[PDB]
Design a protein around this motif. Structure first.
Motif, PDB file in Angstrom:
ATOM      1  N   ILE A  35       0.772  -1.234  -0.146  1.00 30.59           N
ATOM      2  CA  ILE A  35       0.051   0.028  -0.144  1.00 30.59           C
ATOM      3  C   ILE A  35       0.811   1.297  -0.090  1.00 30.59           C
ATOM      4  N   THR A  36       2.260   1.095   0.228  1.00 30.43           N
ATOM      5  CA  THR A  36       3.067   2.392   0.180  1.00 30.43           C
ATOM      6  C   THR A  36       3.541   2.558  -1.184  1.00 30.43           C
ATOM      7  N   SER A  37       3.347   1.727  -2.002  1.00 28.98           N
ATOM      8  CA  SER A  37       3.948   1.920  -3.308  1.00 28.98           C
ATOM      9  C   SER A  37       2.620   2.140  -4.371  1.00 28.98           C
ATOM     10  N   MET A  38       1.529   1.958  -4.067  1.00 31.10           N
ATOM     11  CA  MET A  38       0.377   1.996  -4.926  1.00 31.10           C
ATOM     12  C   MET A  38      -0.019   3.261  -5.184  1.00 31.10           C
ATOM     13  N   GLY A  39      -0.780   3.359  -6.297  1.00 32.92           N
ATOM     14  CA  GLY A  39      -1.407   4.955  -6.636  1.00 32.92           C
ATOM     15  C   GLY A  39      -2.850   4.957  -6.985  1.00 32.92           C
ATOM     16  N   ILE A  40      -3.507   5.790  -6.154  1.00 32.89           N
ATOM     17  CA  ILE A  40      -4.921   6.068  -6.289  1.00 32.89           C
ATOM     18  C   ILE A  40      -5.147   7.513  -6.943  1.00 32.89           C
ATOM     19  N   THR A  41      -6.101   7.429  -7.899  1.00 32.70           N
ATOM     20  CA  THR A  41      -6.437   8.945  -8.369  1.00 32.70           C
ATOM     21  C   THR A  41      -7.890   8.764  -8.556  1.00 32.70           C
ATOM     22  N   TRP A  42      -8.636  10.071  -8.031  1.00 31.18           N
ATOM     23  CA  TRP A  42     -10.014  10.062  -8.382  1.00 31.18           C
ATOM     24  C   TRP A  42     -10.122  11.284  -9.475  1.00 31.18           C
ATOM     25  N   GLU A  52     -12.283  16.343 -17.834  1.00 34.36           N
ATOM     26  CA  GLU A  52     -12.191  15.594 -16.702  1.00 34.36           C
ATOM     27  C   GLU A  52     -11.073  16.108 -15.813  1.00 34.36           C
ATOM     28  N   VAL A  53     -11.257  16.341 -14.496  1.00 33.82           N
ATOM     29  CA  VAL A  53     -10.201  16.908 -13.578  1.00 33.82           C
ATOM     30  C   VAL A  53      -9.942  15.894 -12.513  1.00 33.82           C
ATOM     31  N   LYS A  54      -8.764  16.109 -11.796  1.00 38.59           N
ATOM     32  CA  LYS A  54      -8.324  15.345 -10.684  1.00 38.59           C
ATOM     33  C   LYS A  54      -9.033  15.770  -9.407  1.00 38.59           C
ATOM     34  N   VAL A  55      -9.616  14.817  -8.630  1.00 38.09           N
ATOM     35  CA  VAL A  55     -10.136  15.368  -7.624  1.00 38.09           C
ATOM     36  C   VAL A  55      -9.530  14.945  -6.091  1.00 38.09           C
ATOM     37  N   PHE A  56      -8.533  13.887  -6.441  1.00 37.20           N
ATOM     38  CA  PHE A  56      -7.584  13.465  -4.956  1.00 37.20           C
ATOM     39  C   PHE A  56      -6.416  12.549  -5.976  1.00 37.20           C
ATOM     40  N   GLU A  57      -5.143  12.759  -5.265  1.00 39.07           N
ATOM     41  CA  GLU A  57      -4.034  11.660  -5.864  1.00 39.07           C
ATOM     42  C   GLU A  57      -3.376  11.123  -4.647  1.00 39.07           C
ATOM     43  N   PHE A  58      -3.549   9.926  -4.539  1.00 40.52           N
ATOM     44  CA  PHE A  58      -2.835   9.266  -3.241  1.00 40.52           C
ATOM     45  C   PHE A  58      -1.468   8.469  -3.805  1.00 40.52           C
ATOM     46  N   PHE A  59      -0.585   8.598  -3.031  1.00 42.32           N
ATOM     47  CA  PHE A  59       0.776   8.016  -3.467  1.00 42.32           C
ATOM     48  C   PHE A  59       1.037   7.462  -2.053  1.00 42.32           C
ATOM     49  N   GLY A  60       1.593   6.243  -1.853  1.00 39.88           N
ATOM     50  CA  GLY A  60       2.017   5.680  -0.644  1.00 39.88           C
ATOM     51  C   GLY A  60       2.850   6.985   0.249  1.00 39.88           C
ATOM     52  N   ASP A  61       3.611   7.542  -0.284  1.00 41.86           N
ATOM     53  CA  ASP A  61       4.239   8.549   0.554  1.00 41.86           C
ATOM     54  C   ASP A  61       3.646   9.929   0.611  1.00 41.86           C
ATOM     55  N   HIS A  62       2.731  10.243  -0.269  1.00 41.53           N
ATOM     56  CA  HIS A  62       1.964  11.692  -0.125  1.00 41.53           C
ATOM     57  C   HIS A  62       0.710  11.734  -0.482  1.00 41.53           C
ATOM     58  N   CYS A  99     -12.484   5.973 -10.495  1.00 42.00           N
ATOM     59  CA  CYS A  99     -11.567   5.656  -9.469  1.00 42.00           C
ATOM     60  C   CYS A  99     -10.600   4.691 -10.201  1.00 42.00           C
ATOM     61  N   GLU A 100      -9.315   5.283 -10.054  1.00 45.71           N
ATOM     62  CA  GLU A 100      -7.936   4.267 -10.942  1.00 45.71           C
ATOM     63  C   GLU A 100      -7.081   4.084  -9.909  1.00 45.71           C
ATOM     64  N   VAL A 101      -6.690   2.788  -9.980  1.00 48.39           N
ATOM     65  CA  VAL A 101      -5.731   2.258  -9.060  1.00 48.39           C
ATOM     66  C   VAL A 101      -4.551   1.836  -9.959  1.00 48.39           C
ATOM     67  N   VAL A 102      -3.308   1.867  -9.363  1.00 50.42           N
ATOM     68  CA  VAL A 102      -2.130   1.497 -10.363  1.00 50.42           C
ATOM     69  C   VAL A 102      -1.290   0.655  -9.216  1.00 50.42           C
ATOM     70  N   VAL A 103      -0.925  -0.470  -9.602  1.00 44.04           N
ATOM     71  CA  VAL A 103       0.009  -1.235  -8.790  1.00 44.04           C
ATOM     72  C   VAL A 103       0.829  -1.829  -9.978  1.00 44.04           C
ATOM     73  N   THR A 104       1.989  -0.992 -10.343  1.00 47.34           N
ATOM     74  CA  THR A 104       2.864  -1.258 -11.372  1.00 47.34           C
ATOM     75  C   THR A 104       3.270  -2.739 -11.607  1.00 47.34           C
ATOM     76  N   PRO A 105       3.077  -3.181 -12.851  1.00 48.00           N
ATOM     77  CA  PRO A 105       2.892  -2.670 -13.967  1.00 48.00           C
ATOM     78  C   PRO A 105       0.983  -2.498 -14.251  1.00 48.00           C
ATOM     79  N   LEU A 106       0.471  -2.895 -13.393  1.00 47.82           N
ATOM     80  CA  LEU A 106      -0.846  -2.974 -13.560  1.00 47.82           C
ATOM     81  C   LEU A 106      -1.758  -1.759 -13.304  1.00 47.82           C
TER      82      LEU A 106
END
Ligand SMILES: *[C@@H]1O[C@H](CO)[C@@H](O[C@@H]2O[C@H](CO)[C@@H](O)[C@H](O)[C@H]2NC(C)=O)[C@H](O)[C@H]1NC(C)=O
Ligand SMILES: *[C@@H]1O[C@H](CO)[C@@H](O)[C@H](O)[C@H]1NC(C)=O
Ligand SMILES: *[C@@H]1O[C@H](CO)[C@@H](O)[C@H](O)[C@H]1NC(C)=O
Ligand SMILES: *[C@@H]1O[C@H](CO)[C@@H](O)[C@H](O)[C@H]1NC(C)=O
Length: 212
Positions: A35-42, A52-62, A99-106
Motif C-alpha cells: 500500500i505504500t507503493s500503490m497509486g490511487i487517483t480520483w 475531466e479533472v483530478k479530485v484526489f491523488e494518493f501515493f504511498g508517500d504523499h 477511481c483508478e488504481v495502479v500497482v505497477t505494472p497493472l
C-alpha cells in the motif's frame, strides 16, 4: 485480472445536496499489496462536458486533494477501501467519478455516476385564486397536483379542472422553484384543499392543506 476495482453496484449513487458523501471504490488484488507503493487517483467530469479533472491523488508517500476537504484515507486502504469522501457535496459536483488504481505494472479502474438532489420546500399563498410555491429543488422534473376532501365524499379527489401550473424558474444557486394555481368559487363547507408535491428527492409526497 490480477488487479480489479469494484464501484457501487448498478453504477449510480444518489445523495442529498450538502450531505457528506462517500463514493465507493474497493480494490481486489491477487497478490500481496504494498500500500505504500500503490497509486490511487480520483477523477471527475460533468455529464455534459467531457473535460475531466483530478479530485484526489494518493501515493504511498504523499496525498493531494484538488477539491477541498476531499479525502481517501490510508486507514481505509488497509482493507482495500479506496473510497473518496466529499464533505458537504454541492450540486455542481454531480457527474461521473472514476477511481483508478495502479500497482505497477497493472492498472484498474471503475466509474460511477453521482446524482445530487435537493428537496423542494412548499408554501401556500392564500391571499378565487390560491397558490402553492415549491422551491429550491433539483432536478427540474417535478409534479404538482391538487386534491380535495369534502365532507360528503371523505376521500381525496384530484382536482384537474381549474389548475394552472406556471413555468419552472431558475434560482441563482442552481436549484428551481415552480408555482401552481388553484381557482375555486359553489364549494361545500369544510372541504380540505391540498397542494401535493412529488419529486425524486422526496420519500413521500409533500402535502400542504387549507380550508375556506
Ligand atoms: C424561489 O423561492 C424562494 C422561497 O420563497 C425565494 O426565496 C425567498 O426570497 C425572498 C425574497 O427575496 C426572501 O425574502 C426570502 O428570504 C427567500 N426565502 C428563503 C428562506 O430562501 C426565491 O426568491 C425564489 N426564487 C426566484 C427565482 O424567485
Ligand atoms: C458532515 O460532517 C460535518 C463534520 O465536519 C458535520 O458538521 C455535518 O453536519 C455533516 N453533514 C451532515 C448534514 O451529516
Ligand atoms: C513497499 O514499498 C516501499 C516504497 O517502494 C518500500 O520502501 C518497501 O520496502 C515496500 N515493502 C515491501 C515490498 O516489503
Ligand atoms: C395535510 O393533510 C394530510 C392528509 O390529511 C396530512 O398527511 C399532512 O400531514 C397535512 N399537512 C400539513 C402541513 O399539516
Amino acid at each position: 485480472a490480477d488487479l480489479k476495482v469494484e464501484m457501487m453496484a448498478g453504477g449510480t449513487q444518489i445523495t442529498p445536496l450538502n450531505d457528506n458523501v462517500t463514493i465507493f471504490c474497493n480494490i481486489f488484488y491477487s497478490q500481496p499489496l504494498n500500500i505504500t507503493s500503490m497509486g490511487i487517483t480520483w477523477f471527475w467530469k460533468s455529464l455534459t462536458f467531457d473535460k475531466e479533472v483530478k479530485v484526489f491523488e494518493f501515493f504511498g508517500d504523499h496525498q493531494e486533494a484538488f477539491r477541498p476537504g476531499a479525502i481517501v484515507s490510508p486507514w481505509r486502504l488497509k482493507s482495500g477501501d479506496a473510497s473518496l469522501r466529499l464533505p458537504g457535496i454541492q450540486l455542481e459536483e454531480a457527474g461521473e467519478y472514476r477511481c483508478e488504481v495502479v500497482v505497477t505494472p497493472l492498472k484498474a479502474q471503475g466509474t460511477v455516476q453521482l446524482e445530487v438532489v435537493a428537496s423542494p420546500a412548499s408554501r401556500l399563498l392564500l391571499d378565487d385564486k390560491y397558490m402553492c410555491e415549491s422551491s429550491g429543488f433539483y432536478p427540474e422534473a417535478i409534479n404538482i397536483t391538487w386534491e380535495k376532501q369534502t365532507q360528503k365524499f371523505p376521500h381525496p379527489i384530484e382536482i384537474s379542472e381549474d389548475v394552472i401550473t406556471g413555468p419552472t424558474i431558475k434560482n441563482m444557486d442552481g436549484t428551481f422553484n415552480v408555482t401552481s394555481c388553484l381557482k375555486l368559487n359553489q364549494e361545500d363547507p369544510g372541504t380540505v384543499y391540498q397542494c401535493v408535491v412529488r419529486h425524486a428527492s422526496l420519500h413521500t409526497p409533500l402535502r400542504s392543506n387549507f380550508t375556506l
